[PDB]
Design a protein around this ligand. Structure first.
Ligand code: SAH
Ligand code: SAH
Lengths: 230, 230
């Protein structure tokens, strides 16, 4: 079944893989650097999972006002435990990326609103981008990088996808979780339309959606927008 | 690149796998039994590959008039060698499923015209079905079974597809050959319209296209028709 949150043994298996493969986050970190991330900024991570990105970002930028938000209570627990193990005082919240509920204090205050490998799981994609832009301060940036439906791969992308599937070993049932996340992923045009719809409500000075692979190992969609000036 | 014929080392690898996995042909043979295959009949196998099906059918029906046709001269060579090795007096021809050329002596004379795991590779699917119906005698049947684009899978179909990919060992580059054949495969609507187009030129008493998995291991499209009686 297509279910948004990752919970239970799957969430634990996800963390076991993620925490031991920090290099997989390199491409996303580079995009954040490209988007203009810097120490002291307020950054909101929607669908933060088990907090791998937060630990990475806080290490490079110790004065970041960083908050991770996830729909899974198991992921929020794990993230908090993980941050504590790493010796970091990071904030994680239970919440839905498709709603402002529980994030009203951050409304219009984020320098950077980000999401990695999650937006493909959502039921209401335009609602997620709406939340992104409303959390962003005027002049703030938003950046999603997530899975594309395999119909949008060219031959090279499809080959890379098969190669990724073939990696071994997978923890527990993480292979089919990864593969089904693609089966249920939106098309490029879905991402394009979702961001456009959100930008009509919250005006942007810039927006760009594209597909490439600059490190993760398979092509992924990137969605970037800059909220308009005040 | 999307290329119709399977040649060179890939053709050899295909045969090495095929000859040690006769069980994979069970679903297709059952369809032929359901279609009314019987000893002494004239049967044309379009895109016959290295002759695995021909040897299987010949063993079961020793007086079948079997002709296998393939675009790959390597497959034709291999098929003849394999037939000889297996002690079967079979005929193989170099030819194109999308044209009647080289099969003019068989026009309107086939009790059954069949093709397995090949039509997904073709450039002109309607031309292939046109050739099928023209080879069929009045009252004769045509049956294709081939790959569908993964977009047409439901979750169970997609899980089966991943499971098939996870099978070990694969010979040489056969995994990516099999996988890319799906990447480049037609949709269900493409198969349905192609057969319909052909049926408008060569009238049929019956016509049906469907997807299921009764043994091969992944869902495949079936395309069946019976040419109108004389
Ligand atoms: N509507 C929603 N709101 C918030 N989080 C969601 C969500 N739907 C799915 N998620 C979360 O998105 C995560 C996908 S896994 C990706 C985790 C993390 N961003 C990383 O890159 O490592 C899961 O933790 C899942 O619980
Ligand atoms: N236009 C065409 N005409 C005839 N054969 C073709 C063709 N395009 C591809 N082929 C052949 O289709 C085969 C696909 S492999 C499947 C082989 C066989 N039917 C089996 O079930 O085992 C290859 O041998 C390839 O050479």
């Amino acid at each position: 079944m297509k279910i948004e949150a990752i919970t239970g043994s799957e969430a634990e298996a996800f963390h076991r893989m993620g925490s031991q493969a920090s290099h997989r986050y390199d491409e996303f970190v580079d995009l954040l650097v490209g988007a203009g991330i810097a120490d002291g900024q307020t950054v909101v991570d929607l669908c933060c999972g088990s907090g791998e990105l937060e630990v990475i970002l806080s290490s490079r930028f110790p004065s970041l006002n960083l908050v991770g938000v996830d729909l899974s209570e198991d992921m929020v627990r794990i993230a908090r435990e993980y941050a504590a193990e790493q010796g970091k005082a990071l904030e994680f919240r239970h919440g839905d990326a498709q709603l402002l509920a529980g994030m009203e204090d951050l409304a219009g205050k984020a320098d950077l609103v980000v999401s990695r490998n999650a937006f493909h799981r959502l039921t209401r994609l335009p609602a997620a981008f709406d939340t992104m832009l409303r959390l962003a301060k005027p002049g703030g940036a938003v950046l999603n990088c997530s899975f594309i439906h395999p119909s949008d791969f060219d031959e090279s992308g499809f080959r890379a996808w098969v190669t990724f599937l073939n990696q071994r070993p997978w923890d527990s049932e993480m292979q089919i979780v990864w593969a089904l996340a693609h089966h249920y992923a939106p098309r490029l045009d879905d991402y394009r339309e979702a961001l456009a719809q959100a930008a009509r409500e919250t005006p942007v000075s810039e927006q760009r959606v594209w597909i490439d692979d600059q490190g993760y190992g398979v092509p992924t969609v990137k969605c970037f927008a800059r909220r308009a000036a005040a």
